[PDB]
Amino acid sequence: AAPLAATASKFLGCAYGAQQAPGFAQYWNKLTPENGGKWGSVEAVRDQMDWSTLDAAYRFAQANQMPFQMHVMVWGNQQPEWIKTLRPAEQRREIEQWFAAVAQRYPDIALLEVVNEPLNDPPSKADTGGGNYLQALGGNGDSGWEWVLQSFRLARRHFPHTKLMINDYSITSSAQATQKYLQIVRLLQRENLVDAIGVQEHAFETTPEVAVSVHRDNLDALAATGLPIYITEFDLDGPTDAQQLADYKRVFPVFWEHPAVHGITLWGFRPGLWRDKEAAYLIRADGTERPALTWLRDYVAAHPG
Numbered sequence: 404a405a406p407l408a409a410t411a412s413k414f415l416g417c418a419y420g421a422q423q424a425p426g427f428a429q430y431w432n433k434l435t436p437e438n439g440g441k442w443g444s445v446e447a448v449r450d451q452m453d454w455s456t457l458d459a460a461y462r463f464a465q466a467n468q469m470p471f472q473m474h475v476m477v478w479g480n481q482q483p484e485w486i487k488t489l490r491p492a493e494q495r496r497e498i499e500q501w502f503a504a505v506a507q508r509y510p511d512i513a514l515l516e517v518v519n520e521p522l523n524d525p526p527s528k529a530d531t532g533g534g535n536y537l538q539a540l541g542g543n544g545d546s547g548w549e550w551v552l553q554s555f556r557l558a559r560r561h562f563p564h565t566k567l568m569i570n571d572y573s574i575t576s577s578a579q580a581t582q583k584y585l586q587i588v589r590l591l592q593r594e595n596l597v598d599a600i601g602v603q604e605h606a607f608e609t610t611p612e613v614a615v616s617v618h619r620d621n622l623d624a625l626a627a628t629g630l631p632i633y634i635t636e637f638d639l640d641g642p643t644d645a646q647q648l649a650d651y652k653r654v655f656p657v658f659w660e661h662p663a664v665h666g667i668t669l670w671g672f673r674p675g676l677w678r679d680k681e682a683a684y685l686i687r688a689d690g691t692e693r694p695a696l697t698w699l700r701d702y703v704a705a706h707p708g
């Protein structure tokens with residue numbers, strides 16, 4: 404039994420970790436580590452690196468010839484706790500060492516997610532896993548996004564052959580948010596710092612009060628940069644099987660059939676994925692496939708692009 408996108412022109416991948424492991428390669432052909440590549444997962448204690456969970460995702464991806472998306476170098480959650488109180492110069496040396504460490508250990512990263520959530524969750528908080536290192540990367544600076552520039556400069560320096568991606572949520576749901584995001588992309592491109600645009604597209608981003616057409620128009624706007632688009636963390640809630648199925652039919656094709664979208668990654672498929680309470684899983688606890696998954700296999704087989 405072969406992955407859904409086996410004969411398609413773009414990948415259909417999934418978040419990977421212990422609860423998503425069973426049967427993974429029979430469904431998906433690309434992966435992102437759900438949690439193990441966050442900095443606070445690897446370096447919870449300063450200067451001792453626990454690569455075990457990240458190694459598990461990378462080794463699995465390689466064993467299965469699937470592209471690996473490193474998630475994530477800079478974010479405002481699940482960052483180490485010890486960095487919060489260091490002076491910015493010291494924080495910066497730690498950031499640099501984290502970049503260099505990842506680059507050395509993982510030579511075959513397909514897509515490096517350098518910054519996730521610049522419009523929503525910058526590393527500027529000092530709560531649990533907040534990081535509080537925005538000023539180590541120059542803060543907002545002249546342009547308003549200096550720290551994003553600095554993060555991508557470090558990634559270019561340390562990963563000279565790797566495709567660099569920016570990622571965020573609640574982008575395609577509004578023109579104003581898409582224009583905001585594209586200002587960051589514009590600033591990055593002044594120095595040719597970014598290679599791909601990611602948008603997460605969780606359930607909360609694609610609800611029907613905003614028409615799918617508006618998401619399509621914003622995809623076109625993002626695509627106007629000439630950069631490839633990736634849908635990075637897709638999920639649709641399933642309080643009933645039928646709501647989930649109807650949502651899949653309404654939402655999924657718009658992203659899948661967009662000529663600038665070069666891959667979609669679901670944010671899990673088995674119970675225990677992030678939106679478990681909302682029953683976003685496509686396979687039930689008893690191992691059975693839900694009607695949205697039945698539909699999705701057929702739809703992807705019929706849409707190779």
Ligand SMILES: O[C@@H]1[C@@H](O)[C@H](O)OC[C@H]1O
Nearest residue numbers: 437474519572603636677
């Ligand atoms: O790491 C993921 C993040 O990028 C996004 O906010 O969705 C939840 C997290 O699991």
Ligand SMILES: [Ca+2]
Nearest residue numbers: 449450497500
């Ligand atoms: Ca260190």
